[PDB]
Design a protein around this ligand. Structure first.
Ligand SMILES: [Mg+2]
Ligand SMILES: [Mg+2]
Ligand SMILES: [Mg+2]
Ligand SMILES: [Mg+2]
Lengths: 159, 44, 104, 130, 49, 99
RNA sequence: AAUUUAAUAUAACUAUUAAUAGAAGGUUACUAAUAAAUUAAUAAUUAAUUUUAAAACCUAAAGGUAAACCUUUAUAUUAAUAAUGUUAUGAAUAAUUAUUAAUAAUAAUAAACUAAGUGAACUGAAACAUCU
């Protein structure tokens, strides 16, 4: 059988398991360690769930690529360069940092809801909003219309 | 006479639980029905 | 009117035609999986239309199909598992013997 | 002569290094009687039928869901030229989980909300409040 | 050097013992590593844990 | 040459890009030995997020009625069947165990 | 500016004296990670107190077994709602998606010391049974 009869496409999804259609990245092609740094927990806190979801799978995809290269190197060549292993570990650090941020965020939301569930604390927070920023001397004319629109959306379920 | 084999018996001292206290890992499935006997059941 | 196997074929054809899953999506949603799969070079007994992976040990055949389609867009029609053994090994004769890891 | 480079007996085994050793190692799948079944935690879906089959319960099968729209720009790493941001919760005993911090954050969202934080505006800031 | 070990963690107890050698007996292993390496990647300084 | 060197505090250095101590000669602390200038950096790798949008904030705490994380995503965030998470007692339980 | 001597370390056991107190292992993997606050001193920085996240499977007693395995849809059940499809035949109704209230469970947890029950024989008596 001859491969000249084939039409293996250039957009074939398995190509995502390789870096720029290369068998195994060399030292120069691999991103240097100096130029790089894993995300920081505060940085992830400024990210929406969709964006964090997107980052997670992007991390996983390169993790698969690096895993493929480590295995090829450590199962054929046998070298202990472990440059790919270190890169994967750095990605692994970011992955759990993402997981920590999500848990802390979810816990914070639950804590706030429970705190606002007490009548005394809810009344204090509401009246503080009412007296201070609401019931102004007409400084905001239509801005208060926006203020309320975000008020109903946040505290209550009115959109 | 003195009741040596009944007095020498000892049982575990369960802690006092408040409503704001940690839940024990393992608890009986049925409500207690009798006051605990001071000397417990004879083990001999 | 039709056999079960014919219906399975129709469902897969329908999924491909409509640009949707060619399988049935389960209800247990994993939002942040941590599983990694290693592409493997073809063997002699393979054809240019197949691909072999080193999947996690706790990985169903259905799991890989969903894993490939949803993360990579690759659609796997037939998936088949080969679970290997672990030979006993010892770095020296003085140490305890333990089996090499099983690789799925 | 199994090994042509060993003409005389030197104690070498037919295969392997030692014929003896520990046998108390945990069982695996490939070894045991034909009725043994170890398992690989890879099937907790469905119910064995009375005849000896299986029925997939599709509410237990596991599916990996990816976002409909994927942000391609978020690379796994981060450029080294942006410093590692740090967060300070000065005056907030409970830290990021502290309810009163959440109340303040929604307060800011009310009055002048949907505004990029100090850390987001500039890529040269070293700490940020909150 | 195909071992499939990097993909799993088998023999945790044995690996820990080998990697946590008593500090009194490090000179036993230091001689082993020194005698079994070429001269052009060996330094005359003791290692650090 | 400098006989011995000591440090008397810490500070953030925008050049080394991280917190570094002050490197002062042992004895006189006024004479301060500056840290060397780091070499220029040029990040061109496609696997590095651009600074201008890596830090761009996208999420705001703007709700107490909607969970920011969908319910089906909680299991991935944390283990629901965790043996380390023990509950608290109630009046009913105490009456159940107190003879 | 360099060397020796004696003592001092995360890096030994044993004995006596003094003081204080009554605490995880293993298997391999989709590896089993943290975040902060207050006070005390040179914008930062250590120390003390307080809070906080994750933590797979087995270690008799959710069930079972041939330990690290299988069955238990708590991503669950009931109820309500908005929509879809949708039967039924506007309304109903469940199925689904998504919210809210109620309904639930995780035993490896030491050794020595103390007290209580039962309780030998070798041996000594230069034998042996009372006795030991
Ligand atoms: Mg098979
Ligand atoms: Mg056999
Ligand atoms: Mg059986
Ligand atoms: Mg005698």
């Amino acid at each position: 059988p001859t491969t000249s009869n084939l039409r293996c496409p250039d957009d074939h999804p398995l190509w995502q398991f390789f870096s720029n259609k290369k068998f195994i990245r060399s030292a120069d092609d691999l991103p240097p360690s100096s130029h790089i740094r894993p995300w920081s927990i505060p940085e992830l806190r400024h990210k929406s769930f969709n964006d964090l979801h997107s980052l997670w799978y992007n991390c996983l995809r390169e993790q698969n690529v690096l895993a493929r290269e480590n295995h090829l190197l450590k199962n054929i060549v046998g070298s202990t360069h472990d440059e790919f292993s270190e890169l994967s570990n750095s990605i692994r650090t970011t992955m759990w940092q993402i997981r920590h941020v999500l848990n802390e965020r979810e816990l914070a939301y639950s804590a706030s809801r429970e705190f606002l569930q007490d009548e005394s604390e809810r009344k204090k927070f509401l009246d503080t909003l009412a007296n201070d920023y609401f019931l102004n001397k007409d400084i905001p004319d239509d801005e208060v219309a926006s203020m309320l629109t975000r008020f109903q959306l946040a505290i209550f379920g009115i959109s | 006479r003195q009741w040596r084999l009944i007095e020498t018996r000892k049982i575990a001292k369960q802690p006092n639980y408040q409503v704001g206290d940690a839940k024990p890992l393992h608890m009986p499935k049925e409500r207690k029905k009798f006051p605990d006997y001071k000397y417990g059941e004879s083990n001999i | 009117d039709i056999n079960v196997s014919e219906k399975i074929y129709k469902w897969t054809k329908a999924g491909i035609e409509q640009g949707k899953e060619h399988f049935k999506v389960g209800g247990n949603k994993v939002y942040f999986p941590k599983a990694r799969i290693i592409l493997l070079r073809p063997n002699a007994k393979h054809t240019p239309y197949q691909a072999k992976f080193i999947v996690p040990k706790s990985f169903n055949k259905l799991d890989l199909r969903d894993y490939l389609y949803h993360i990579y867009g690759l659609r796997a029609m037939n998936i088949t598992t080969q679970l290997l053994h672990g030979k006993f090994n010892r770095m020296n004769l003085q140490t305890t013997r333990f089996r090499e890891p099983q690789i799925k | 002569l199994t090994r042509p480079w060993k003409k005389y007996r030197d104690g070498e085994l037919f295969y392997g290094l030692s014929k003896v050793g520990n046998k108390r190692v945990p069982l695996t799948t490939k070894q045991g009687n034909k009725t043994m079944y170890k398992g690989t935690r890879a099937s907790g879906i469905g119910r064995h039928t009375k005849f000896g089959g299986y029925v997939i319960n599709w509410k237990k099968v596991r599916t990996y869901v990816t976002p409909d729209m994927v942000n391609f720009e978020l690379k796994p790493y981060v450029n080294a030229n942006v410093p590692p941001l740090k967060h300070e919760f000065k005056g907030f005993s409970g830290g990021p989980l502290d309810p009163r911090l959440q109340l303040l954050k929604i307060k800011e969202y009310i009055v002048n909300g949907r505004v990029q934080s100090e850390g987001a505006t500039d890529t040269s800031c070293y700490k940020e409040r909150g | 050097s195909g071992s499939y070990q990097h993909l799993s963690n088998v023999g945790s107890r044995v690996m820990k013992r080998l990697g946590n050698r008593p500090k009194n007996f490090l000179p036993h292993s230091e001689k082993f590593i020194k005698k079994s390496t070429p001269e052009f990647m060996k330094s005359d300084l003791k290692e650090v844990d | 040459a400098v006989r011995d060197v000591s440090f008397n505090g810490s500070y953030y250095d925008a050049d080394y890009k991280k917190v570094m101590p002050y490197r002062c000669v042992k004895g006189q602390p006024d004479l301060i030995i500056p840290w060397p200038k780091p070499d220029p950096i040029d990040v061109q790798t496609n696997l590095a997020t651009d600074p201008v949008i890596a830090r761009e904030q996208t999420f705001w705490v703007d709700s107490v009625v909607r969970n920011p994380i969908p319910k089906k995503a909680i299991p991935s965030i944390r283990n629901p069947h965790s043996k380390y998470k023990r509950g608290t007692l109630t009046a009913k339980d105490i009456a159940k165990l107190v003879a």
